Design a protein around this ligand. Structure first.
Ligand code: NA
Ligand code: NA
Ligand code: NI
Ligand code: NI
Length: 327
DNA sequence: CATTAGA
DNA sequence: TCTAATG
């Protein structure tokens, strides 16, 4: 956690670089497992060899580990850290909709910078266009102050179109989070569950609604169960407008909401932890259900959940207010 | 770990 | 269809 720091960080930088700039999944895949066990390692890694003894530690990484131990740096790391080609991929990548593949290809054509990107806005697809469009706001964190306003609106409409709708702004926001990076709305309605053959309009309806009044301003992608957009608080009595923000809404079969809800609320840790516990207590938990553990090894059987509580009850835990879903 | 675009 | 991208 700190004894192993610098080693694991460089190990990560190393990996990142392979996976992006280059296309070396393995190398990249290599660096991480390494980066992983060395972090679990309980003692100060004092030398290559010492590390090397690890699983996942080859001579290659060892080699690097020495050089790093030896001198506060690493050349390849210094060289990569400098490299404009590589530097660039690192950047373009930020743009919403721009992955590494694309990052590499733009770079090859010479689009390095943002400006470059604009001039060739033609080469960019919708998503990416939008990305480039809201580049700045895409980066800004959302204040819960605003987080609250947004939520106020969304629930308001959802209700309006259908009083039967169930919506939950999941995420950190749900966890008190002073700030948040983007809104996640979990949707479900009673007339949509595991079996009942869809009702696409169900998603569609509300979407309309939300753009209707001007909350949704664009569509990143919209399909029958997952809307992905941009949205924004009405600019008041002017002098101050609101930044464009990423927002996702997903429809769910009412017969899986709470797991789903549980699930997105997280935190990552709250999850696994709640996850490892449901296990001893004879169960299995995942993004949509909870199934009693069968002795024969495994077993199925979706238990009936009517709220986040039911889930705990099941695994017999303490109802954890989201506030304290932190770990 | 899956859903949507795209080409 | 595959392959990319976001979550
Ligand atoms: Na080894
Ligand atoms: Na990106
Ligand atoms: Ni998100
Ligand atoms: Ni989020």
């Amino acid at each position: 956690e700190t004894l192993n720091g610098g080693i694991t960080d460089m190990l990560t930088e190393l990996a990142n670089f392979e996976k992006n700039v280059s296309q070396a999944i393995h190398k990249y895949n290599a660096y991480r497992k390494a980066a992983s066990v060395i972090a679990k390692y309980p003692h100060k890694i004092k030398s290559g060899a010492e590390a090397k003894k690890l699983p996942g530690v080859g001579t290659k990484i060892a080699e690097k580990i020495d050089e790093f131990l030896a001198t506060g740096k690493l050349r390849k790391l210094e060289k990569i850290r400098q490299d404009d080609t590589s530097s660039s991929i690192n950047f373009l990548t930020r743009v919403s909709g721009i992955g590494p593949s694309a990052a590499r290809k733009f770079v090859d054509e010479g689009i390095k910078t943002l400006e470059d990107l604009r001039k060739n806005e033609d080469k960019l697809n919708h998503h990416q266009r939008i990305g480039l469009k809201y580049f700045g706001d895409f980066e800004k964190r959302i204040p819960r102050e605003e987080m609250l306003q947004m939520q106020d609106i969304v629930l308001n409409e959802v209700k309006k179109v259908d009083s039967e709708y169930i919506a939950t702004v999941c995420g950190s926001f749900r966890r008190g989070a002073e700030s948040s990076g983007d809104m996640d709305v979990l949707l479900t309605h009673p007339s949509f569950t595991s079996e009942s053959t869809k009702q696409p309009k169900l998603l569609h309806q509300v979407v309309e609604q939300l753009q209707k009044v001007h909350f949704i301003t664009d569509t990143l992608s919209k399909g029958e169960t997952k809307f992905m957009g941009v949205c924004q608080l009405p600019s008041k009595n002017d002098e101050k407008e609101y930044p464009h923000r990423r927002i996702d809404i997903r429809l769910i079969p009412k017969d899986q909401y709470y797991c789903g809800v549980l699930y997105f609320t997280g935190s990552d840790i709250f999850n696994k932890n709640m996850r490892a516990h449901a296990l001893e207590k004879g169960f299995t938990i995942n993004e949509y259900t909870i199934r009693p553990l069968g002795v024969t090894g495994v077993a199925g059987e979706p238990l009936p959940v009517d709220s986040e509580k039911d889930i705990f009850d099941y695994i017999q835990w303490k109802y954890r207010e989201p506030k304290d879903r932190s770990e």
